[PDB]
Amino acid sequence: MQIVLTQSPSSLSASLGERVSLTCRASQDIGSSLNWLQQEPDGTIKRLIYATSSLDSGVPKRFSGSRSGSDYSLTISSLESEDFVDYYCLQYASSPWTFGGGTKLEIKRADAAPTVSIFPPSSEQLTSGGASVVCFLNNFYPKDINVKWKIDGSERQNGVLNSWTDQDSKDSTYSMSSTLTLTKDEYERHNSYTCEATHKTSTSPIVKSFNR
Amino acid sequence: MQIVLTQSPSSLSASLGERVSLTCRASQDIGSSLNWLQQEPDGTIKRLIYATSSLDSGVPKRFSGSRSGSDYSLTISSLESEDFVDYYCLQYASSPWTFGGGTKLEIKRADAAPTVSIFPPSSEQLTSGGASVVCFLNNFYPKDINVKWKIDGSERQNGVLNSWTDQDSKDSTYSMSSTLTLTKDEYERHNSYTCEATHKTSTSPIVKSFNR
């Protein structure tokens, strides 16, 4: 049986100067044999902490590692802007070596509803095969959101491409585009087009629509 | 001894059933103490190979690890669709443990020029926080692309967010949005807005504009 490391939380929202802890629970005893890794935006992975508690050379003092039973914690005493990256626990007590799911440090922000814009497809696009209806969802928080597409009241699930931004460095919000990619034929078959957005900040969905 | 692992190549394009090799050169002797990791797009990390040559339990036979002096190689004999992810070498011969820069496998395809679409901001958007001009660059390959913004012929450098999609599973292309955030005042000061793209597949830059 592979040792499973349950990493808490998956996403952690905090502010500059906050004290935060990442927890990593081992499914079987690994003793002191846990390392803490950091993955930078350039994709590079470093080891911060080894053997549960020990700081690697050059690692800032604000990083510290502890163990409470089968729960291993990385603690950052006072968060800095460089620290809002991905973190992984790694156990090397047993083969195979296994990693936690990871923890993304994210900047905590007041909840924001998305500004929703719906654009019908271009005349240039339309005369060639394709018809893409684009739905913009701008500057919402938190990241968790849902977009439905409706054609003449009826939900359409397929032919939909969703693209998210990372957290905005300026205002700490998320944006996303949903594209309902379609044929010229299909588009002119139906009349009414609606993307509806479901977010924490509204008990009922935000709807944007158009016809011909 | 603090050991540098030089990983080749940084990016690797190949097709289904192709044989590929990753190299990882150690700056100092690490003996057989090198592991090969796989990172899934969701950020999950597995160990495929340990102690240079050994396959971890359940790892497919098409993965193989070898060493030629201080050069350590991961070979995938016949690529499958699940295999087009990130790979890292990891040495544990010396403290601190160090990783290679990484290697992203992508699916090779014919070079594609982006289709450029420009969306002016909504009235709702324009009054409320950011007034966003959005420039879509669709179904281009390779992923590397550069997008400038011009306002009435003058280049705008700040208030621009550039966001990539992962490689499309259907057609192996990349898409990309460039968002020029602007003040309500700034926007209605000027009339002409232009995103201009530099890509391999165009000898000259790709231009989209609109006026008021």
Author numbering:
A (entry chain B), B (entry chain A): 1 to 212
What does the paper say about this structure?
In this work, the first crystal structure of a light chain dimer originating from mice is described. To achieve this, the recombinant production of antibody fragments, Fab and/or scFv, is needed. This work started with the quest to crystallize the murine IgG1 monoclonal antibody (mAb) 6A8 Fab with its specific antigen, Der f 1, originating from house dust mites and associated with asthma and rhinitis.
While this structure’s asymmetric unit contained two protein chains, molecular replacement showed that both molecules corresponded to the light chain portion of 6A8. In both chains (denoted as A and B), residues 1 to 212 could be modeled. The variable domain expands from residue 1 to 107, and the constant domain is made up of residues 112 to 212. First, the variable and constant domains are composed of the classic antibody β-sandwich folding. Secondly, buried within each, there is an intradomain disulfide bond, formed by C24–C88 and C135–C195, in the case of the variable and constant domains, respectively. PDBePISA predicted this dimer to be stabilized by nine polar interactions, which include seven hydrogen bonds and two salt bridges, and several hydrophobic interactions. In this sense, consistent with the idea that the variable domain is driving this dimerization, this region contributed around 750 Å2 of this total buried space, while the constant domains are responsible for the remaining 550 Å2. In fact, the superimposition of this crystal structure with an AlphaFold2 (AF2) model of 6A8 Fab resulted in an overall RMSD of 1.8 Å (across 411 Cα atoms).
